[PDB]
Amino acid sequence: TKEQRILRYVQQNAKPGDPQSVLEAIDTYCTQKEWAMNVGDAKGQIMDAVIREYSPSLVLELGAYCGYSAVRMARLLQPGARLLTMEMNPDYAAITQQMLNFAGLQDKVTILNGASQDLIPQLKKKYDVDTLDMVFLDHWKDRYLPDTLLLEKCGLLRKGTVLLADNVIVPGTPDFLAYVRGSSSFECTHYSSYLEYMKVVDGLEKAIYQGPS
Amino acid sequence: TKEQRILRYVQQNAKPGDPQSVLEAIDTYCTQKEWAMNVGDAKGQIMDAVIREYSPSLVLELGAYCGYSAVRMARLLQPGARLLTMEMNPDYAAITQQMLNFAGLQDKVTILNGASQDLIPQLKKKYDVDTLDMVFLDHWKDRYLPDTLLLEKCGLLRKGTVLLADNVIVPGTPDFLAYVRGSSSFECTHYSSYLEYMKVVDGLEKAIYQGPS
Numbered sequence A, B: 001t002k003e004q005r006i007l008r009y010v011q012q013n014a015k016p017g018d019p020q021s022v023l024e025a026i027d028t029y030c031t032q033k034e035w036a037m038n039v040g041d042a043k044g045q046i047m048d049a050v051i052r053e054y055s056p057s058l059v060l061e062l063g064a065y066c067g068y069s070a071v072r073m074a075r076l077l078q079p080g081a082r083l084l085t086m087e088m089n090p091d092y093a094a095i096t097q098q099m100l101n102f103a104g105l106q107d108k109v110t111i112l113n114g115a116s117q118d119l120i121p122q123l124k125k126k127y128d129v130d131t132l133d134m135v136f137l138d139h140w141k142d143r144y145l146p147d148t149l150l151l152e153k154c155g156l157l158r159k160g161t162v163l164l165a166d167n168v169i170v171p172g173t174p175d176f177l178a179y180v181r182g183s184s185s186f187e188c189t190h191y192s193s194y195l196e197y198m199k200v201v202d203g204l205e206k207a208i209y210q211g212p213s
């Protein structure tokens, strides 16, 4: 699979226990061999600056995929801080675990195998969670708003909890964006950037007719 | 419509009778306001170099859309040379005509209103055509191969007729590309480039929870 190819490329090219090199290896392979839905380096630098500002002790990530953003966030956590990341595809969750293992970040991250709507109500009881400091939304785009309402209902948000959402323009999360921007329960800020790895290769073919034979 | 917006933008910003400025006006508007399926400047420079090499006396264009490539090709034709361009959408063909009118290139171009499969067999009789020197393919991608076989059947190709096809990688014309590359009746050359106007804008939203009220 495309996702196995990515993991193998990192294992052959990155330096073990170096999270920065793992990120660069993923970025190169997806810019010049196979496009994949990682957050990418340009939005990733915005992610970095937001995490550095708030220094969250407990982060929830929705949709781990190959682990690109788990590595990006875990490397910036302080000693003792934790990240929990939810991934419903068993293939993808195993890849994310090997990615973090290779990065040396495995001790800070806990992968949760299942669907957000099933797991979010089990967070406090099964994972000793009180409230989240930060939530990163990057799963199916029509589930951002439903899961936000679910996190509120389950008491996982506190005043000051930072939600951070990818792809609010492309492919777009229009119901989520209208809700949070119109609600007095959320103060919103927009960080404009560019979709990941989008120098799309195409070409012209010249075909010169030679005659009947 | 998006296509009216493009034409109006050119009328307000380009210099009348200057084909180069008309091309730049289209390019700016589609890079920073609305994406549209013009060939674009990067593949357009390859088009330019191919036309300059072969100096065709008679060019057929399949799919005029807004007239971007009609203007690009007509401005490079020698005195007396002709371009015929087929466009089945009445809205689009009227825009292409106003584009060329504004560029001052109207005298070299003849717009044909209808479907390629209907018009290609009427070319010689109704438009005094013998054989084509060059054909530019940029219409529906599944019609490149059918129309190529139709042009051959109707006797419109001569030895040395240059076919030049856009989008052979993205969105792709896989049956056409396999056919011409495997056929002894065509000598093929690939010019690698990049899809037009593809710095796709996206962003992150930060939404900070404020509490129940």
Ligand SMILES: CNc1ncnc2c1ncn2[C@@H]1O[C@H](/C=C/CNC(=O)c2cc(-c3ccc(F)cc3)cc(O)c2O)[C@@H](O)[C@H]1O
Pocket: A037, A038, A039, A062, A063, A064, A065, A066, A086, A087, A088, A089, A092, A114, A115, A116, A117, A138, A139, A140, A141, A143, A166, A167, A170, A171, A195
């Ligand atoms: C619904 N509850 C859920 N609970 C747990 N995991 C869930 C999940 N939904 C989805 N997942 C997992 O999240 C991941 C899904 C992410 C969906 N992302 C996209 O569609 C996406 C798509 C693009 C994109 C870019 C260009 C384009 F032309 C079309 C799409 C860009 C992105 O950054 C994206 O994030 C998978 O790993 C999936 O198994």
Ligand SMILES: CNc1ncnc2c1ncn2[C@@H]1O[C@H](/C=C/CNC(=O)c2cc(-c3ccc(F)cc3)cc(O)c2O)[C@@H](O)[C@H]1O
Pocket: B037, B038, B039, B062, B063, B064, B065, B066, B086, B087, B088, B089, B092, B114, B115, B116, B117, B138, B139, B140, B141, B143, B166, B167, B170, B171, B195
């Ligand atoms: C079939 N016979 C025909 N005879 C006469 N005119 C015909 C025609 N078919 C189509 N047309 C006209 O050609 C034009 C159609 C062009 C189709 N082009 C594309 O799909 C296209 C699409 C992209 C594209 C780029 C990015 C992307 F994500 C998806 C698509 C890029 C391009 O350069 C393209 O040319 C219209 O003006 C239509 O009315």
Ligand SMILES: [Mg+2]
Pocket: A037, A038, A039, A138, A166, A167
């Ligand atoms: Mg994303």
Ligand SMILES: [Mg+2]
Pocket: B037, B038, B039, B138, B166, B167
């Ligand atoms: Mg095209």
